[PDB]
């Protein structure tokens, strides 16, 4: 649904409601859907424009006061219906561009205050080498583990804990002090995970493959390895398990958990892989 | 400067008191055997 800049203000103002209208067919008809509003601030720009050319009086930042009732109408149409209304769903993934990282503004504040989570993105992390540049401290999801597979819960709890510790300690660590091994292990594992969570553009991965990779990263098959080598460790392991161990992936996709059998099989596969391959450490 | 100072402080305190907690965990059960489940 393209409401571009040459397209008039009312079309830019109507496009997200049109998208929600197209998605309510799925939501009501027992099907599922996802809707991505891109440049949700241009909607508010267009509403400001309309009200100011209709001589309506402004508020703060020259916006009207009905911006909350502009976004609430729109985002309250996303919903998960019951088993009597079909069982459908409409997920929402709004997008917002801040200026100088100022999230103390009006529109960012409203939309953060009316959403079930946040995914912050930073330029410091985008240029340091972390791509996607997601800050996992500020980023949250109130739903959380309930929207997560058990196989992914098992790994991601430990991952979040380790990354919290690493984020706490790394700033002090970077000053050239000399630390014990219990802390050097924290730094090593945090660097490994930070180098694991990087991804190329238009290169998404399945859930089972994410599970396997984060297993390799969490059980310590990347701590001694060099940080710069993980970008090829990842791809070689992906190719290996996609070629010779699709059955493990199918089992994870079906059962949606990690039994001890799959645990042992995955560990054996990783051991075979490290045997067959060689890296800088 | 702000996040800089805060994170440096947090890391230093964490390391220091991690060491101290390790030491206290070493020397606890001797000086307080009434908690030691070895004698229970």
């Amino acid at each position: 649904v393209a409401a571009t800049a040459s397209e008039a203000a009312p079309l830019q103002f109507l496009a997200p409601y049109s998208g929600c209208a197209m998605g309510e067919w799925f939501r009501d008809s027992g099907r599922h859907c996802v809707i991505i509003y891109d440049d949700l601030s241009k909607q508010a720009t267009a509403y400001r424009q309309m009200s100011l050319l209709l001589r309506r009086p402004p508020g703060r930042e020259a916006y009207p006061g009905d911006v909350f009732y502009l976004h609430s109408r729109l985002l309250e149409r996303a919903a998960k219906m019951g088993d009597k209304s079909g069982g459908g769903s409409l997920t929402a993934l709004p997008v917002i561009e801040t200026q100088a990282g100022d999230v103390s503004a009006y529109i960012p504040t409203n939309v953060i205050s009316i959403t079930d989570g946040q995914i912050f993105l930073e330029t410091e992390l985008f240029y340091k080498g972390i791509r996607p540049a997601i800050n996992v401290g500020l980023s949250v999801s109130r739903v959380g583990s309930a929207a997560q597979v058990k196989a992914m819960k098992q790994v991601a709890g430990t991952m979040k804990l380790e990354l919290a510790q690493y984020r706490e300690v790394a700033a002090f660590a970077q000053f050239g002090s000399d630390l014990d091994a219990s802390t050097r292990q924290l730094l090593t594992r945090g660097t490994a995970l930070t180098e694991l969570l990087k991804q190329r553009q238009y290169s998404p991965m399945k859930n089972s493959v994410q599970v396997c990779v984060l297993y390799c990263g969490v059980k310590g098959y990347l701590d001694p390895l060099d940080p710069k080598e993980i970008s090829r460790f990842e791809s070689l392991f992906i190719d290996y398990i996609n070629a010779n161990h699709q059955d493990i992936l199918k089992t994870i996709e079906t059962e949606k958990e990690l039994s001890e059998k799959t645990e042992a099989k995955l560990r054996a596969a990783v051991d075979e892989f490290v045997a067959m391959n060689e890296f800088k450490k | 400067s702000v996040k800089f100072m805060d994170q440096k402080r947090s890391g230093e305190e964490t390391v220091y008191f991690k060491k101290e907690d390790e030491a206290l965990l070493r020397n606890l059960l001797a000086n307080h055997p009434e908690y030691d489940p070895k004698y229970s």
Partner: peptide, 12 residues
């Protein structure tokens, strides 16, 4: 902004 400059002045 203001909060940034005020916090910086306090810290310095």
């Amino acid at each position: 902004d203001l909060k940034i400059v005020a916090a910086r002045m306090k810290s310095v």
